[model samples]
Target chain A: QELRRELEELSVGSDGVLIWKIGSYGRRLQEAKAKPNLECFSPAFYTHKYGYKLQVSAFLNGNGSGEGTHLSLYIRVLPGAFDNLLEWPFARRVTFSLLDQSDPGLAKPQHVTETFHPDPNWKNFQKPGTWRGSLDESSLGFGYPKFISHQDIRKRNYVRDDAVFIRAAVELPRKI
Target chain B: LRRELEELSVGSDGVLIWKIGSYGRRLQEAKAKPNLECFSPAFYTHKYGYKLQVSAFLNGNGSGEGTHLSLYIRVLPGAFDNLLEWPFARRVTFSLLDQSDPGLAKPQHVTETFHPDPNWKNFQKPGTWRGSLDESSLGFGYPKFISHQDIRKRNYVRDDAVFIRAAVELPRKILS
Candidate 1:
């Protein structure tokens, strides 16, 4: 729990997106298996006008990927932080992108878009939300796992000084 | 008009790609009418193909209020004038780069179907073919366009520089 707290705190920055720059990308993959399902949360929680605190997360070596297969990412409602001022079953569009730091001019970032609808059970509110393309199949994990391979990242341009970046954008439903 | 025409005389393969720097300063100068009209260097479909130009204004014009940015595409006069079909049918996309942080700089974009009427009296001369000064359901112009306060807060105008990317998608049939 202590370690998890620290990881969550370090996840996001002032910018709405969380940029996890993994130095030595290959080494991190090898190490992540040992610390499987390591989780990180957004820096600041999102508060809907109705007062629900929304939190997003990224998990290393999570879901059915077992070790060295895939990364699981999610969004969740913080029931502990919920003010209950808004109606339940929160629904919103969540967009995740693996920034193509490699070359913006040549390749556009790979994006996975999903609409999140919280489960009806109040007890389940704390659970993570799921979306299409939620899991990437590869030892590399997430993004276009197959498209941006470990071999491709080794090139000086993409993994410059050794690192990768990811971003997430959440679009809330317009208020009536 | 002569200076504007000279400025609009550059292009590549039917698309006029222009990179506008110092975006923040331009936005400020666009407060007035005449200064708001800026044209991209012109482009052509082929060596002797139809000629085209893109014009933009930071502040609103016509239907667009001061709240939105405006963009338009125009067909130049006397260059393959009668060869191409009238009521120009093409698709154009406008993009605003997030200059604040390259890692976080996912461009904001909007695309529109351009259908300029050749039968209209105004069509006899070189003028705006089609574009928008207001945000469309498809997301074209910057609604708030990084308010001055937000610009300072986000550092979008680093070294007083910003960039805009534009593309014209010619029909596959036309290209072949």
Candidate 2:
């Protein structure tokens, strides 16, 4: 129980920027390892109050080629409060940053970041119902499977106080 | 796993959660060709410490092969092995986590542990270094760590993935 961490709120800035902070990092990671299907999703954060409603998921133990050696992260569209009003195929740049907690005044650390624009033709970027496949509820979300390595996370201040901070920024698209 | 939320560390419990995805596929590959390498990333006993690794046989090994999952632990060459104890005799534990939702049911884990004998060759530091067990000749292990049918009976494998945890017992004091 001493190893257990306290519960904290899922933080997402008003501008749809998520500074997803997870506590009990070791315990949860162990839980995920024990239960490979531990679907770790960020609290629902919208592109805007009535914009593309979505959530981000992470494979703490890594996934795909990064599995076991790295951390894999994904972004998926969910049935938002304004899904019917939104346009099809959400196309915009979504940036992910694994922040470093090191001092900004001295040993300034560079955050590990990745940015990608949704392909207008992809189903996952489309309406939630259409993106749904026959294989099950999964196969809908998309993002990098090899976001960052476990070894690299240690080399920097990405994780501190048994917690990891992953920030997701949903850019304001040129289109309405 | 998480390496204490891993790499970031505030935790160094000498544990490795080797998460495996593509369960159906890996199990198939092992059936066609038994004992596919499911090696957890090698990790240290402490900061700049002894290197250790865990290996699993997806389809099982020897008699356990084709029926059960096999598990083992091995000592590997490390940066500080020269200053450490020879023939690692620490206790290592392997576990198959139940993985069910803890809120709904109390998940049980199938665990097996062994204290290495000083006489074991694999327990001794490697003369060379390694690849696919090339550097380490043998492992101190269990041919029948768990069974396929039993693993399937519960939530052991979910979302086409499974996780194996290997924990090594060693001194915690970083230095004198």
Candidate 3:
């Protein structure tokens, strides 16, 4: 019992923030709350029925040290959040390429690329600051976006591709 | 019960494979010849989003009647979007429950599933991450004799096996 108590009291831990570099942003925000009454906001044009891209670099905290890291990006659309980008028809061929590398083999990446499709009728909530659309139909606050990355146990490094692109039916969230 | 890949096992060349979770939990030990993979799930509510994965194992040559099981919780951080909510002060709980039917004459096969949820706070960074359940309240398990008996009689299910619950608390702040 004494040993057990001691073991229970012992604690192990780490402290600090894992910094991520948002390399570039390229998206087309639109308001499709109503179908026939479709409104194509600025830059509201179609790319390919399915074409989206994301490029990011994982850094250690804010310091530009340590090798890159593993990361998974998650994107959620409005109204019904179930129809995710990963399940899209063209998503299977999605690729994550490390743009800044000299040799493609050095990418040494894992599950780096992904894709998503937004509903044509997704509500175009007003842009956070700008009145992009109706106050009621706009996003509650900000749409949810997440990134998950795995640890490269072998390399002891988390280096990852600098950017990722999506080629599907989903468009970028409206910007202010 | 089988072991996980983290534990070390002895062989002619020296310790090669790692013996983690026990076979009782359906976790198998890693072998020198090939790598192993396991499928796991994590759930989240509107409020909470981060989580960690843990496992336990039992040794075949253990002492008494009860299996010699070892438990471990590996803190797998939530995806980036989930972690960004607070950057600190986020909390997640992991719980294990027993899968048995007392009404049955023989033991019932048991398996374990992990459930994750978030808590909502009145004050704090608005839209920041939170959890509904407290980590300390989570539970663990030890199957009843009848349940084990069912296993011996082949009446118990191996496919739908049950598990006793074990839990661990994960905080938004991680130690470096």
Candidate 4:
């Protein structure tokens, strides 16, 4: 339970942006599979004029691409302490990349780019922002059905010291 | 997947060539430690008895960028030079393998037709042709070929190892 509580703490940067390096990314996926309710959050983005925070999470054993198929990744927006200062239906461009720590010649990062918009229903705004590399609305989160296989993750040196790195960038709108 | 060189008998002169492995390391070493040229083993054409050579350098010779990878094809000064035809005209193709993940692997290549004019005064003693895999040359190379940062990020060069393939074609009509 302590670990679960710790997961809630956001790791923010001085730039008011959240850059979370999920170490042991493969292991975390395994844990998420064992505990379906498992979820992780990014550091809060409070520096923006409108106070808001984003949640980062992963679902292993597949979420939308079927069980034992893909690794689903997500980002959820949370109203901050200064929610009244923010606009409704948050819209922003989120970019995610699965880093390749090996050879650049061979490394072609898998990227998921999504332009997130607020839903008309406030309740839907509370839900996670997801992209499965498809236009299908039924898809859950950003799905990578072939997200580095376990055998390759181990053999290909992707899991050096039994860990991998994931990077996320949120492009905020220009200030008026 | 290795790309097959399409062999077409355009002339009676049968041109022969072979593959060379570990091209990436040689390129890296040549770049890091200047004043070194990596030369491929000599190959011979069966019908005309012409000898050919391939070489690569990271440092631009007269017209290439320091960061770009430069490749060249040379007709060696052979015993059969006077007996054979001068001003060699052939189509050459150089390929750099994508050694990354299979799903992400796709080799990059450049094809150029060469016609070394023996009549030209600048034409070196032995006919030679040059090409680059970087942005400096608009016609035949990638601007960054492959950036230094990407080299480390992607596993293009693992443990100082890289692979390259080359093919030379002679049209039967050239001799006719």
Writing each residue's lDDT as its tens digit, candidate 4 over A131-169 gives 323354442233244454444445544445555555556
For this target, which candidate reaches the highest TM-score against the unseen true structure? 2
Question: What docking grade does candidate 2 earn?
Answer: incorrect
Compute DockQ for each candidate against the true complex.
0.01, 0.01, 0.01, 0.01
lDDT of 2: 0.73
Which wins on lDDT, candidate 1 or candidate 2? Answer: 2
Tens digit of per-residue lDDT, candidate 4, span B1-176: 44332122111133322223455655566668675656655555444455666665554443444665555656655555666555554455555444343322443333334445455332233433333332121122233344344444544444354433445565445553
RMSD score of candidate 1 (Å): 16.9
User: Model 4's CAPRI class?
Assistant: incorrect
Question: What is the alpha-carbon lDDT of model 3 when measured against the actual structure?
Answer: 0.27
Clashing residue pairs in all predictions, respectively, total 2, 3, 57, 17
TM-score of chain B taken alone, every candidate: 0.57, 0.84, 0.30, 0.53
TM-scores, all models, native as reference: 0.35, 0.48, 0.21, 0.35
Interface RMSD values for the candidates, listed in order? 18.3, 16.3, 19.2, 25.4
Q: Which sections of candidate 4 miss by over 4 Å?
A: A1-11, A14-17, A25-27, A33-37, A40-50, A103-158, B1-176
- Candidate 4 displacement at residue A53 in angstroms: 1.1
Candidate 1 on A60-138: residue-level lDDT in tens?
A: 4444433345555555555422232234454444455545564557776444333344444433342233342335332
- Candidate 3 has a DockQ of 0.01
List where candidate 2 sits over 4 angstroms from the true fold: A1-176, B1-12, B128-136, B174-176
Residue B124 local lDDT, model 4: 35
lDDT by residue (tens digit), candidate 3, A36-103: 22211111111221122221222211111121332222222222111111122222122222222234
Model 3 in CAPRI terms: which quality? incorrect
lDDT of each: 0.46, 0.73, 0.27, 0.47
